[PDB]
Amino acid sequence: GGTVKAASGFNAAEDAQTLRKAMKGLGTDEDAIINVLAYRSTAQRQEIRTAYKTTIGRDLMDDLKSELSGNFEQVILGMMTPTVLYDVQELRKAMKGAGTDEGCLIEILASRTPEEIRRINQTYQLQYGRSLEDDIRSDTSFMFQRVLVSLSAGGRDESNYLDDALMRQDAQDLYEAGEKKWGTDEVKFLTVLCSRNRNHLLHVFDEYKRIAQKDIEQSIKSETSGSFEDALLAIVKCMRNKSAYFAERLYKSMKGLGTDDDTLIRVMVSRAEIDMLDIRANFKRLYGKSLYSFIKGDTSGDYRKVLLILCGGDD
Ligand SMILES: [Ca+2]
Ligand SMILES: [Ca+2]
Numbered sequence: 001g002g003t004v005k006a007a008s009g010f011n012a013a014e015d016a017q018t019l020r021k022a023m024k025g026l027g028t029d030e031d032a033i034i035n036v037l038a039y040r041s042t043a044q045r046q047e048i049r050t051a052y053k054t055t056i057g058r059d060l061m062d063d064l065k066s067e068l069s070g071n072f073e074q075v076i077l078g079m080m081t082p083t084v085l086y087d088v089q090e091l092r093k094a095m096k097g098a099g100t101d102e103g104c105l106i107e108i109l110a111s112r113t114p115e116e117i118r119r120i121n122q123t124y125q126l127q128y129g130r131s132l133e134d135d136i137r138s139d140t141s142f143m144f145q146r147v148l149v150s151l152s153a154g155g156r157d158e159s160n161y162l163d164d165a166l167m168r169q170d171a172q173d174l175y176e177a178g179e180k181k182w183g184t185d186e187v188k189f190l191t192v193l194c195s196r197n198r199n200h201l202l203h204v205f206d207e208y209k210r211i212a213q214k215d216i217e218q219s220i221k222s223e224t225s226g227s228f229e230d231a232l233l234a235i236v237k238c239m240r241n242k243s244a245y246f247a248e249r250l251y252k253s254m255k256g257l258g259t260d261d262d263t264l265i266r267v268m269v270s271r272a273e274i275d276m277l278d279i280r281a282n283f284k285r286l287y288g289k290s291l292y293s294f295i296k297g298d299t300s301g302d303y304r305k306v307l308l309i310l311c312g313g314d315d
Pocket of ligand 1: 023027
């Protein structure tokens with residue numbers, strides 16, 4: 001499960017007072033801020049925002065924004081945003097720039113369940129006046145656009161039903177699409193990849209290996225390239241092992257000179273109370289080093305401090 005849990009003996013107004021005292025005056029007590037916000041669940045954080053206003057008379061987000069800066073501010077504000085809205089905002093941000101952050105689009109649209117995808121669509125439209133699909137259509141192109149549009153519909157079957165005839169026809173279709181460099185009959189291979197339930201799909205992947213004598217992932221890496229390749233692979237990885245998918249996003253955001261702070265922040269904030277314990281297990285297995293030591297080595301200051309707390313511990 002997750003690493004961040006709801007605190008016991010919770011008193012929103014006592015917390016509001018603590019935050020105010022940490023920010024009042026010239027400067028800021030970042031550690032007092034961390035010791036409160038990082039040890040509360042998102043729901044509790046929302047209760048602190050409400051109490052701050054009602055008890056302090058101030059808007060908490062405005063103070064956090066004016067008081068903090070940099071990546072630290074980015075992490076903290078991320079932690080303060082209600083869950084569905086955070087995804088909606090990250091999606092919006094990924095599209096509006098000189099160039100789209102296609103990785104963010106894939107990461108979210110591929111790893112979210114049907115119910116989460118439904119909430120995101122409703123909130124996005126409410127918040128921006130247009131549907132997520134319209135913006136995807138506006139900022140992305142070709143086969144990559146088409147894949148994201150399918151995922152955005154969120155129509156994946158949730159039962160565990162297996163139709164044997166269907167499974168064999170399905171692997172056959174993926175095999176043909178692949179033979180055709182995943183370029184024709186987009187509607188056929190997308191239907192399989194996006195609509196079929198997990199159990200059925202996992203079987204389709206096994207039937208595919210027999211038909212192709214090659215794993216689906218190697219076929220994709222071969223017959224495909226660019227963002228379209230990353231999208232297809234993300235779907236396959238999230239169906240097989242989603243937590244291993246996130247461990248890999250985290251690994252690639254820190255591996256090498258520099259860091260992709262945006263990705264590191266979004267994954268740590270968004271998955272902290274969901275499957276961080278699992279992401280950690282797969283990170284260790286896959287990379288031989290714990291997530292903790294990677295973050296610890298790629299970051300510094302308060303930013304790092306709050307990131308390690310979201311990590312939860314060493315492995
Ligand atoms: Ca201050
Ligand atoms: Ca690095």
